[PDB]
């Protein structure tokens, strides 16, 4: 499946005690490049997802403070299965990867540059992954919600970048991104 080089933000999210893994089926996915720290930011979507009986994976710039504390407590006390991971990479590269993840999961990228805020997120904006496995250092998503036209559009976009790039690093990352999308 599709791998992300980031693991769980807290080990308290673990569902598999023996393997120290988070293991979800049919998981809803929040995709954002915003930091989630204030409890007010996370409460609305948490309330909505709790009603749905679905697991939730949160991908954000970071999750910390009271917002993280609220997530761990709701998981530990059996309200819902939820896990947070950091968005991969940095800067424009992080943005590009989140766009990829949004496409693959059919999520709306709650992007800071477009003025989208986590506080007004609704379930409609969440993506879905068939299988989610979160380890301490990596995450693997299996998804079937992607529009194949969107995938082909994205690959065409990345194709031009790959043909044009002259660095080994970007050559490696772009060619592997096209693989993750394919």
């Amino acid at each position: 499946g599709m791998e992300i080089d980031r693991g769980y933000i807290s080990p308290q999210f673990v569902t598999n005690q023996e393997r120290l893994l988070v293991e979800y089926d049919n998981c809803r996915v929040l995709v954002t490049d915003q930091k989630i720290d204030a409890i007010r930011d996370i409460i609305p979507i948490l309330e909505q997802v709790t009603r749905l009986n679905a697991p939730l994976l949160i991908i954000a710039e970071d999750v910390s403070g009271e917002a993280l504390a609220t997530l761990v407590v709701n998981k530990l006390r059996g309200v819902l299965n939820v896990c947070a991971i950091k968005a991969p990479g940095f800067g424009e590269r992080r943005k590009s990867l989140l766009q990829d993840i949004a496409i693959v999961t059919g999520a709306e990228f709650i992007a800071k540059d477009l003025g989208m805020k986590v506080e007004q997120a609704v379930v409609e904006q969440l993506g879905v992954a068939r299988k989610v496995t979160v380890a301490n250092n990596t995450t693997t998503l299996i998804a079937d919600a992607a529009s194949k036209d969107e995938i082909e559009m994205r690959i065409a976009q990345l194709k031009k970048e790959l043909a044009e790039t002259d660095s080994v690093y970007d050559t490696e990352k772009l060619s592997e991104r096209i693989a993750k999308l394919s």
Side-chain angles (χ1 to χ4, degrees), residues 1-63 65-182:
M2 172 175 177
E3 201 186 271
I4 303 172
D5 202 22
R6 299 286 201 175
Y8 39 66
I9 283 177
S10 169
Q12 292 285 76
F13 291 135
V14 157
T15 61
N16 191 320
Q17 304 296 328
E18 182 67 15
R19 307 186 61 185
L20 297 186
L21 299 173
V22 178
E23 299 178 314
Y24 296 156
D25 318 336
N26 302 131
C27 181
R28 287 289 190 145
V29 185
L30 185 280
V31 179
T32 187
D33 59 350
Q34 304 260 23
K35 299 189 216 177
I36 308 181
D37 179 274
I39 190 177
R40 113 184 47 80
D41 290 12
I42 199 57
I43 281 299
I45 194 60
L46 204 56
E47 289 176 345
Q48 299 176 55
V49 173
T50 294
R51 301 184 219 118
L52 295 205
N53 155 76
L56 176 62
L57 172 71
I58 295 169
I59 309 180
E61 182 191 332
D62 197 17
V63 183
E66 192 166 22
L68 179 59
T70 300
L71 294 183
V72 45
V73 167
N74 272 272
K75 184 271 178 175
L76 292 179
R77 311 305 170 221
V79 179
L80 87 167
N81 261 323
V82 60
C83 181
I85 68 171
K86 293 181 172 180
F90 166 82
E92 292 300 319
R93 197 170 315 267
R94 172 167 54 198
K95 187 182 311 181
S96 291
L97 293 177
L98 286 171
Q99 293 161 353
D100 283 12
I101 296 166
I103 291 165
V104 168
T105 62
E108 289 184 33
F109 178 16
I110 309 199
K112 60 174 59 178
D113 291 339
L114 302 204
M116 308 298 296
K117 293 298 206 305
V118 176
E119 185 186 355
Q120 307 126 331
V122 295
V123 175
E124 285 78 3
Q125 298 172 273
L126 305 173
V128 52
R130 181 179 196 300
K131 268 330 177 287
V132 179
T133 300
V134 189
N136 65 316
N137 275 328
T138 59
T139 297
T140 301
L141 300 186
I142 293 179
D144 60 9
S147 155
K148 291 317 177 68
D149 291 341
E150 289 185 26
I151 293 293
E152 294 184 358
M153 172 211 63
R154 185 60 166 178
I155 287 177
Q157 292 170 344
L158 298 189
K159 175 187 94 77
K160 188 173 188 183
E161 296 184 42
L162 176 57
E164 293 178 332
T165 190
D166 63 348
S167 88
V168 172
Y169 183 76
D170 284 338
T171 294
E172 185 176 340
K173 295 313 178 185
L174 283 166
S175 62
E176 95 184 15
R177 279 175 62 193
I178 294 176
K180 267 165 274 304
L181 289 164
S182 298

